[PDB]
Amino acid sequence: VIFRLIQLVVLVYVIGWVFLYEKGYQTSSGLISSVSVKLKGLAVTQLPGLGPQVWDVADYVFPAQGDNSFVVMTNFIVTPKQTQGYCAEHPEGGICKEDSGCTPGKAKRKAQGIRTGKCVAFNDTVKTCEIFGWCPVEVDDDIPRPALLREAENFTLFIKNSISFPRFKVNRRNLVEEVNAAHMKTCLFHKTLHPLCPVFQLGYVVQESGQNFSTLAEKGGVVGITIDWHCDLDWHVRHCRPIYEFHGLYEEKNLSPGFNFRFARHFVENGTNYRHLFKVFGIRFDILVDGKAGKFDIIPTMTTIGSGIGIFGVATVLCDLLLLHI
Amino acid sequence: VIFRLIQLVVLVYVIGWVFLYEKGYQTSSGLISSVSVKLKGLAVTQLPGLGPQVWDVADYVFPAQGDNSFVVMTNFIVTPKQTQGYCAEHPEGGICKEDSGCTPGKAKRKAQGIRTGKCVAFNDTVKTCEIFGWCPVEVDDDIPRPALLREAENFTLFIKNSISFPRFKVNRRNLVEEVNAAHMKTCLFHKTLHPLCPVFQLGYVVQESGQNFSTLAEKGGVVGITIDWHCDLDWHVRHCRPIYEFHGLYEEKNLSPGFNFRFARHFVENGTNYRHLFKVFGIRFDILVDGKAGKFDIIPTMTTIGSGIGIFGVATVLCDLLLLHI
Amino acid sequence: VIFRLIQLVVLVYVIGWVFLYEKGYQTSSGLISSVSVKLKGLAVTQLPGLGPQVWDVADYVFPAQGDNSFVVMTNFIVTPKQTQGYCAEHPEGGICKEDSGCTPGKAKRKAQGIRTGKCVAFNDTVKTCEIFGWCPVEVDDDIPRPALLREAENFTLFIKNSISFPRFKVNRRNLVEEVNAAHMKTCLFHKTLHPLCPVFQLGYVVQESGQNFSTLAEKGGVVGITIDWHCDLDWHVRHCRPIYEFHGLYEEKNLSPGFNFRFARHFVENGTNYRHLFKVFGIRFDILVDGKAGKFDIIPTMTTIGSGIGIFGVATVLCDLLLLHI
Ligand SMILES: Nc1ncnc2c1ncn2[C@@H]1O[C@H](COP(=O)(O)OP(=O)(O)OP(=O)(O)O)[C@@H](O)[C@H]1O
Ligand SMILES: Nc1ncnc2c1ncn2[C@@H]1O[C@H](COP(=O)(O)OP(=O)(O)OP(=O)(O)O)[C@@H](O)[C@H]1O
Ligand SMILES: Nc1ncnc2c1ncn2[C@@H]1O[C@H](COP(=O)(O)OP(=O)(O)OP(=O)(O)O)[C@@H](O)[C@H]1O
Ligand SMILES: *[C@@H]1O[C@H](CO)[C@@H](O)[C@H](O)[C@H]1NC(C)=O
Ligand SMILES: *[C@@H]1O[C@H](CO)[C@@H](O)[C@H](O)[C@H]1NC(C)=O
Ligand SMILES: *[C@@H]1O[C@H](CO)[C@@H](O)[C@H](O)[C@H]1NC(C)=O
Ligand SMILES: *[C@@H]1O[C@H](CO)[C@@H](O)[C@H](O)[C@H]1NC(C)=O
Ligand SMILES: *[C@@H]1O[C@H](CO)[C@@H](O)[C@H](O)[C@H]1NC(C)=O
Ligand SMILES: *[C@@H]1O[C@H](CO)[C@@H](O)[C@H](O)[C@H]1NC(C)=O
Ligand SMILES: *[C@@H]1O[C@H](CO)[C@@H](O)[C@H](O)[C@H]1NC(C)=O
Ligand SMILES: *[C@@H]1O[C@H](CO)[C@@H](O)[C@H](O)[C@H]1NC(C)=O
Ligand SMILES: *[C@@H]1O[C@H](CO)[C@@H](O)[C@H](O)[C@H]1NC(C)=O
Ligand SMILES: [Mg+2]
Ligand SMILES: [Mg+2]
Ligand SMILES: [Mg+2]
Missing domain, CATH: 1.10.287.940 (atp-gated p2x4 ion channel)
Structure with a gap:
C-alpha cells in the first residue's frame, strides 16, 4: 500500500x-517595455557671487527626453565662459618649475590641451605647463559639500511604463486602473502605502535603494529602479500590476565613488565662441523593466x-x- | 504489436x-545588437506671428545621435526667450486673491519657482503667486490640435541594426544582401511587399503598431519596433534575416495619454542668459532587438x-x- | 557486473x-547593471581656414552623460552658421536646368526643405531647386580622409559598471578590489596583461573588436563591449570579476558603412537664429552587461x-x- x-x-x-x-x-512570454520619465521639482543655487539660478526639469535631467537610464543632476561644478585659448593647465596634469620640464605636444593620459611647452603660472604658488584648449581650465578639486541641488531629494519622478506581451497581445501601463487623475495629483509612491503611484520622490527612491541622498547628492550616485510585471493573464488584466524595487550600493571607501560627467553649453557672445562647462554630479536612475505573462x-x-x-x-x-x- | x-x-x-x-x-546563442537610426524628412511650422520654421533631423530627433529608444518630435509648445526672473506662476500651481494666500518658499509638488509670497496677476482674470524662475512661465494648456509636426508621418526612419552572435562568431546587419544601393534609394518598408527594406516611414510604423498617427502626433505616443533575428546557421548566412514587428496601444481614455518632455536651448543675447523651452510631444520609438542563432x-x-x-x-x-x- | x-x-x-x-x-540569478562611461583625451582639428579647434569629452561624446550605447566622435563635417532661409538645395535632391523642372512643395524622400519651385545655381556648374530651410545646405560629399578626430584612437574610456544580483543581494563594481588608486592612474586595459583595468584605450578596444580604427575613424563604426559577470557566490565575493569582450565587423563592401548622425548647436548672433550643423562620424560603443550569479x-x-x-x-x-x- x-x-x-x-x-x-x-x-x-x-x-x-x-x-x-x-x-x-500556462505558457510564458516576455515583455517589451517603453519607459517614459518626467521629473518635477525645482532647485535654486545662489552662488555668493552669482544671483539665484533656478534648475528645472529641462536643466537637471540628462537626457532631457528621458530614457531607461537617465541622470538627475544633484551637484555641479561650472566653469563659465570657457574659450579656446592658451592658459595654464590644471596641476593634476603635472607641475613644472621651468619651461624645460614642459614638452610641446599632448599629454599621454587625461590630456587637457595641446601643451605649448613653456611653463606658466596656474596660480601664485603653482606653475603648470601652458596648453591650448578650453580656458580657463576646469578646477573641480572642491566639490560643494552641501550639494547645490540637494533639493533634488524632493523632486518627483513620474515613471510612465508602457509594456506589451506581444505573444498574448496584452498591453499594460504602470498607470494601472487604480491610479486615477486624483491620485496622480497628490500621490507619492510608497512601498506599502501607495505601491502603485507612478510618481516617485527621488529622496524616497534613493532611501529605498539602501542609500543616503545627502551622500549621493554631493558626488553623484546610481539607483536602479526595477519594474517587474509578473502577470497571470488567466486572471482579469486589472491584476497585471507592476512591482517597483530600488537598488544601489554607495561605499565611500570604494574607489571612484558616485557618478559624474561633463557637458558643455556652447554659445556665441561678442562674436566669439564660448562654452559653459558643467561637471554634473548626479544620480543615474537605471529603470530596468522585466517580467513575464502567464496565460493558460x-x-x-x-x-x-x-x-x-x-x-x-x-x-x-x-x-x-x-x-x-x- | x-x-x-x-x-x-x-x-x-x-x-x-x-x-x-x-x-x-542545434546549440543556441543570443545576440548582441547595436541599432543605428537616421531620420529623414522635414517639417515646416509657420506660426501666424512667426515666419516659417523648418525642422530637420537635427531638431526633431531626441537624442540626435539616436539610440534603441529615441523620440521623434511630432508636436511642440515653445516658450521663447525664457529668462530667470520674477513673474506670475502658472495657475496650475494655485490661484490667489491676495498676497496673504501666497507663502514665500517653494511649492511641495510640481514647483515652478521660488514663490516670493506676493500675489500677482497671471493675466487679467487670474492672479497667481509670484515666483522666481524661468519667465514667462510655460503655458502648455493649448496643445495644437493639428500637430505642428504632423508631417512627421512621412518622415523616413532608417534602422541600421548590426547584430553579432558571439558564440558562433557570426555578424549580421539588417541591411541584408537583398538590400542594395538601388533599394536604399527608393524603398519604403512594407510588412509584405518590402519586408527587408530598412527605411521605415513613420506613418506606416505607427499604423502597423495599431495606432493612428494623427492622434499620436498631437500629444505624443509610444511605438515599439522589435527586430527579431531567428536564424538557422546550418543554412547559408544570407538567410539570417531580421523580422520587424511594430507595437503600441494608444487609449485616449487612459490617463496621461501620449509622451512629452521639456528641453531647453540656452543662449546668450544682449549679455543676458535666455533659453527656449520646448514641451516636445513626440513618438518614442523603442527599438528592441532580440533573437537567437541555431547552429548544429x-x-x-x-x-x-x-x-x-x-x-x-x-x-x-x-x-x-x-x-x-x- | x-x-x-x-x-x-x-x-x-x-x-x-x-x-x-x-x-x-546552485540557484542562478541574473543581474541588473548600470554603466557609467567617462572619456578622457583631446583632439585638435586645425582647418586650413579655421584656427585650431580642441575637442574634449564634453564635445565628442554623445550623449555627454553617457549611456550603455554612446558615440565617440571620430570624424565630422560641419556646416557653420546655418540659418533658415532660401538657398539652393544639395544636388543629391535633384539637378534642374530651368524653373519648370522644379515643383513647389517638399520632396517625397530625403527632403532638404520647402522647394520654392524655381531653379537656382547650387554652384557654377550645377543648378538645384531653391528650397527654404537651413542655409547654406550641408555638403557632406567629401568625408575627410584622415579623420579629424583620428586622435580618438588614444582616447581613454573609463567604464564604471555597477551590477547587482538582487536575489542574492550582492553588489559588484567592475572596479574590483585589485583595481586601486595607483592602477586607475596609469593602467590601460589589456586582454591578458591588465584584464581588470576599467580604463580602455579606444584604439585598443576597436583593435580587439577585429576592426581598424583608421577605417572606423573616417566614416564611423560600431564596437560592442560586453561585460560578463559569471560569478560563483559560494566563493569569496572578490572573485566576482567582469570579463570584457569587444565585438564589431566593418566591411567596406557592405552598404551604408559606418555610423554617422547630424546634430545642431543652435545659437543667436546679431539678433538672428543660427545653428552649427555637424555630421558626426563616430564609433558607437554599445556596452552590454550580462551575467549570472550562482550561490549554493x-x-x-x-x-x-x-x-x-x-x-x-x-x-x-x-x-x-x-x-x-x-
Ligand atoms: N577615461 C578615463 N581615462 C583615464 N582616467 C580616467 C578616466 N575617467 C576617469 N579617470 C580617472 O579616474 C579617477 C576616478 O574617476 P572619476 O571619474 O570617478 O573621478 P573624478 O575626480 O570625477 O575625475 P575627473 O575630474 O578626472 O574626470 C580620477 O583620477 C580620474 O581622473
Ligand atoms: N514627475 C511628476 N511629478 C508629479 N506630477 C507629475 C509628474 N510628471 C507628470 N505629472 C503630472 O501628471 C499628470 C499627467 O502627466 P503628463 O506628463 O502626461 O501630463 P502633462 O500635461 O504633459 O504634464 P505637465 O505639463 O504638468 O508636465 C499632470 O497633471 C502632470 O502635471
Ligand atoms: N531615414 C532615411 N530615409 C531615407 N534614406 C536614408 C535614410 N537614412 C539614410 N538614408 C540613405 O541611405 C544611404 C546610406 O545611409 P547612410 O546614413 O549610411 O549614408 P550617408 O552618406 O551618411 O547619408 P546622408 O548624408 O544622406 O544622411 C544614403 O543614400 C542616405 O541618403
Ligand atoms: C593653487 O593651485 C593648487 C593646485 O590646484 C592649490 O592646491 C592651491 O591651493 C592654489 N593656491 C591658491 C592660492 O589658490
Ligand atoms: C524636502 O522636504 C521638505 C519639503 O516639503 C523640506 O522641509 C526639506 O527641507 C526638503 N529637503 C531638501 C534637501 O530640500
Ligand atoms: C546622510 O548623511 C548625512 C550627512 O552625511 C547625515 O546627517 C544623515 O544622518 C545621513 N542619513 C540620512 C538618512 O540622511
Ligand atoms: C487667464 O489664464 C487662465 C488660466 O490659464 C485662463 O483660463 C484664461 O482663459 C486666461 N484669460 C485670458 C484673457 O487670457
Ligand atoms: C504625407 O503623404 C503625402 C506626401 O507624399 C502628402 O500628400 C500627405 O499630405 C502627407 N501627410 C502629411 C500629414 O504630411
Ligand atoms: C485618425 O484620426 C483622425 C482625426 O482624429 C481621423 O480623421 C482619421 O480617420 C483617423 N484614422 C486614420 C487612419 O487616419
Ligand atoms: C558643384 O557641385 C557638384 C555637386 O555637388 C560637384 O560635383 C561639383 O564638383 C561642384 N563644382 C564646383 C566648381 O564646386
Ligand atoms: C597615439 O599613440 C601615440 C600617443 O602616445 C602617438 O605616437 C600616435 O601618433 C597616436 N595616434 C594618433 C592617431 O593620434
Ligand atoms: C588600417 O588602415 C590603414 C589605412 O587604411 C592602414 O595603413 C593600416 O595598416 C590598417 N591597419 C592598422 C592596424 O592600422
Ligand atoms: Mg577632476
Ligand atoms: Mg502642463
Ligand atoms: Mg550625405
Missing part, C-alpha cells in the same frame, strides 16, 4: 507544485501532464528498485 | 518534434538523442504499467 | 557534470539529486531493456 502512497505524493507534487505553483498549464494554453498543459506521467513512471521504477534491494 | 507501435510514435515525436521542429541537434553542434545532438532514449525508456515503462493494470 | 558499471557512469555523470560542472547545487541553495541541490536519481532510474530501465533484447 506504501507503493501507491508514494504515487499520491508524486501526484500531489505534480499537481500541487508543477501544475499549480509553477503554473505548468493547452500545449503546456498537455506537456506538463505528460511530464507528470513521466515523473510518475520514473517514480514507480524507483520504488520498484527500492523494494527489491530493500 | 501495439507496444512497438507506441515506440514508433515516441520515435516520431522525438525525431519529428524534438530533434527537428525544436532543432534539438554534436553535444546538443547527443543530449537530444539521450533525451529521446530516456523518453523512450519512460514510455516503455508507462506502456508496461498500462498493460498490467489494463 | 556491467549493470552496476553503467550505474557508476551515470553516477559520475550526475555528480561530475550535472552536480559539479553545471553547478546544479538546498532546493536546487535536492532537485538536482532527484534528477540524478531519476536519470539513474531511467538508465537502469534502459540497461534492463538492452540486456533483454541483447
Whole structure:
C-alpha cells in the first residue's frame, strides 16, 4: 500500500507544485517595455557671487527626453565662459618649475590641451605647463559639500511604463486602473502605502535603494529602479500590476565613488565662441523593466501532464528498485 | 504489436518534434545588437506671428545621435526667450486673491519657482503667486490640435541594426544582401511587399503598431519596433534575416495619454542668459532587438538523442504499467 | 557486473557534470547593471581656414552623460552658421536646368526643405531647386580622409559598471578590489596583461573588436563591449570579476558603412537664429552587461539529486531493456 502512497505524493507534487505553483498549464512570454520619465521639482543655487539660478526639469535631467537610464543632476561644478585659448593647465596634469620640464605636444593620459611647452603660472604658488584648449581650465578639486541641488531629494519622478506581451497581445501601463487623475495629483509612491503611484520622490527612491541622498547628492550616485510585471493573464488584466524595487550600493571607501560627467553649453557672445562647462554630479536612475505573462494554453498543459506521467513512471521504477534491494 | 507501435510514435515525436521542429541537434546563442537610426524628412511650422520654421533631423530627433529608444518630435509648445526672473506662476500651481494666500518658499509638488509670497496677476482674470524662475512661465494648456509636426508621418526612419552572435562568431546587419544601393534609394518598408527594406516611414510604423498617427502626433505616443533575428546557421548566412514587428496601444481614455518632455536651448543675447523651452510631444520609438542563432553542434545532438532514449525508456515503462493494470 | 558499471557512469555523470560542472547545487540569478562611461583625451582639428579647434569629452561624446550605447566622435563635417532661409538645395535632391523642372512643395524622400519651385545655381556648374530651410545646405560629399578626430584612437574610456544580483543581494563594481588608486592612474586595459583595468584605450578596444580604427575613424563604426559577470557566490565575493569582450565587423563592401548622425548647436548672433550643423562620424560603443550569479541553495541541490536519481532510474530501465533484447 506504501507503493501507491508514494504515487499520491508524486501526484500531489505534480499537481500541487508543477501544475499549480509553477503554473505548468500556462505558457510564458516576455515583455517589451517603453519607459517614459518626467521629473518635477525645482532647485535654486545662489552662488555668493552669482544671483539665484533656478534648475528645472529641462536643466537637471540628462537626457532631457528621458530614457531607461537617465541622470538627475544633484551637484555641479561650472566653469563659465570657457574659450579656446592658451592658459595654464590644471596641476593634476603635472607641475613644472621651468619651461624645460614642459614638452610641446599632448599629454599621454587625461590630456587637457595641446601643451605649448613653456611653463606658466596656474596660480601664485603653482606653475603648470601652458596648453591650448578650453580656458580657463576646469578646477573641480572642491566639490560643494552641501550639494547645490540637494533639493533634488524632493523632486518627483513620474515613471510612465508602457509594456506589451506581444505573444498574448496584452498591453499594460504602470498607470494601472487604480491610479486615477486624483491620485496622480497628490500621490507619492510608497512601498506599502501607495505601491502603485507612478510618481516617485527621488529622496524616497534613493532611501529605498539602501542609500543616503545627502551622500549621493554631493558626488553623484546610481539607483536602479526595477519594474517587474509578473502577470497571470488567466486572471482579469486589472491584476497585471507592476512591482517597483530600488537598488544601489554607495561605499565611500570604494574607489571612484558616485557618478559624474561633463557637458558643455556652447554659445556665441561678442562674436566669439564660448562654452559653459558643467561637471554634473548626479544620480543615474537605471529603470530596468522585466517580467513575464502567464496565460493558460493547452500545449503546456498537455506537456506538463505528460511530464507528470513521466515523473510518475520514473517514480514507480524507483520504488520498484527500492523494494527489491530493500 | 501495439507496444512497438507506441515506440514508433515516441520515435516520431522525438525525431519529428524534438530533434527537428525544436532543432534539438542545434546549440543556441543570443545576440548582441547595436541599432543605428537616421531620420529623414522635414517639417515646416509657420506660426501666424512667426515666419516659417523648418525642422530637420537635427531638431526633431531626441537624442540626435539616436539610440534603441529615441523620440521623434511630432508636436511642440515653445516658450521663447525664457529668462530667470520674477513673474506670475502658472495657475496650475494655485490661484490667489491676495498676497496673504501666497507663502514665500517653494511649492511641495510640481514647483515652478521660488514663490516670493506676493500675489500677482497671471493675466487679467487670474492672479497667481509670484515666483522666481524661468519667465514667462510655460503655458502648455493649448496643445495644437493639428500637430505642428504632423508631417512627421512621412518622415523616413532608417534602422541600421548590426547584430553579432558571439558564440558562433557570426555578424549580421539588417541591411541584408537583398538590400542594395538601388533599394536604399527608393524603398519604403512594407510588412509584405518590402519586408527587408530598412527605411521605415513613420506613418506606416505607427499604423502597423495599431495606432493612428494623427492622434499620436498631437500629444505624443509610444511605438515599439522589435527586430527579431531567428536564424538557422546550418543554412547559408544570407538567410539570417531580421523580422520587424511594430507595437503600441494608444487609449485616449487612459490617463496621461501620449509622451512629452521639456528641453531647453540656452543662449546668450544682449549679455543676458535666455533659453527656449520646448514641451516636445513626440513618438518614442523603442527599438528592441532580440533573437537567437541555431547552429548544429554534436553535444546538443547527443543530449537530444539521450533525451529521446530516456523518453523512450519512460514510455516503455508507462506502456508496461498500462498493460498490467489494463 | 556491467549493470552496476553503467550505474557508476551515470553516477559520475550526475555528480561530475550535472552536480559539479553545471553547478546544479546552485540557484542562478541574473543581474541588473548600470554603466557609467567617462572619456578622457583631446583632439585638435586645425582647418586650413579655421584656427585650431580642441575637442574634449564634453564635445565628442554623445550623449555627454553617457549611456550603455554612446558615440565617440571620430570624424565630422560641419556646416557653420546655418540659418533658415532660401538657398539652393544639395544636388543629391535633384539637378534642374530651368524653373519648370522644379515643383513647389517638399520632396517625397530625403527632403532638404520647402522647394520654392524655381531653379537656382547650387554652384557654377550645377543648378538645384531653391528650397527654404537651413542655409547654406550641408555638403557632406567629401568625408575627410584622415579623420579629424583620428586622435580618438588614444582616447581613454573609463567604464564604471555597477551590477547587482538582487536575489542574492550582492553588489559588484567592475572596479574590483585589485583595481586601486595607483592602477586607475596609469593602467590601460589589456586582454591578458591588465584584464581588470576599467580604463580602455579606444584604439585598443576597436583593435580587439577585429576592426581598424583608421577605417572606423573616417566614416564611423560600431564596437560592442560586453561585460560578463559569471560569478560563483559560494566563493569569496572578490572573485566576482567582469570579463570584457569587444565585438564589431566593418566591411567596406557592405552598404551604408559606418555610423554617422547630424546634430545642431543652435545659437543667436546679431539678433538672428543660427545653428552649427555637424555630421558626426563616430564609433558607437554599445556596452552590454550580462551575467549570472550562482550561490549554493538546498532546493536546487535536492532537485538536482532527484534528477540524478531519476536519470539513474531511467538508465537502469534502459540497461534492463538492452540486456533483454541483447
Ligand atoms: N577615461 C578615463 N581615462 C583615464 N582616467 C580616467 C578616466 N575617467 C576617469 N579617470 C580617472 O579616474 C579617477 C576616478 O574617476 P572619476 O571619474 O570617478 O573621478 P573624478 O575626480 O570625477 O575625475 P575627473 O575630474 O578626472 O574626470 C580620477 O583620477 C580620474 O581622473
Ligand atoms: N514627475 C511628476 N511629478 C508629479 N506630477 C507629475 C509628474 N510628471 C507628470 N505629472 C503630472 O501628471 C499628470 C499627467 O502627466 P503628463 O506628463 O502626461 O501630463 P502633462 O500635461 O504633459 O504634464 P505637465 O505639463 O504638468 O508636465 C499632470 O497633471 C502632470 O502635471
Ligand atoms: N531615414 C532615411 N530615409 C531615407 N534614406 C536614408 C535614410 N537614412 C539614410 N538614408 C540613405 O541611405 C544611404 C546610406 O545611409 P547612410 O546614413 O549610411 O549614408 P550617408 O552618406 O551618411 O547619408 P546622408 O548624408 O544622406 O544622411 C544614403 O543614400 C542616405 O541618403
Ligand atoms: C593653487 O593651485 C593648487 C593646485 O590646484 C592649490 O592646491 C592651491 O591651493 C592654489 N593656491 C591658491 C592660492 O589658490
Ligand atoms: C524636502 O522636504 C521638505 C519639503 O516639503 C523640506 O522641509 C526639506 O527641507 C526638503 N529637503 C531638501 C534637501 O530640500
Ligand atoms: C546622510 O548623511 C548625512 C550627512 O552625511 C547625515 O546627517 C544623515 O544622518 C545621513 N542619513 C540620512 C538618512 O540622511
Ligand atoms: C487667464 O489664464 C487662465 C488660466 O490659464 C485662463 O483660463 C484664461 O482663459 C486666461 N484669460 C485670458 C484673457 O487670457
Ligand atoms: C504625407 O503623404 C503625402 C506626401 O507624399 C502628402 O500628400 C500627405 O499630405 C502627407 N501627410 C502629411 C500629414 O504630411
Ligand atoms: C485618425 O484620426 C483622425 C482625426 O482624429 C481621423 O480623421 C482619421 O480617420 C483617423 N484614422 C486614420 C487612419 O487616419
Ligand atoms: C558643384 O557641385 C557638384 C555637386 O555637388 C560637384 O560635383 C561639383 O564638383 C561642384 N563644382 C564646383 C566648381 O564646386
Ligand atoms: C597615439 O599613440 C601615440 C600617443 O602616445 C602617438 O605616437 C600616435 O601618433 C597616436 N595616434 C594618433 C592617431 O593620434
Ligand atoms: C588600417 O588602415 C590603414 C589605412 O587604411 C592602414 O595603413 C593600416 O595598416 C590598417 N591597419 C592598422 C592596424 O592600422
Ligand atoms: Mg577632476
Ligand atoms: Mg502642463
Ligand atoms: Mg550625405
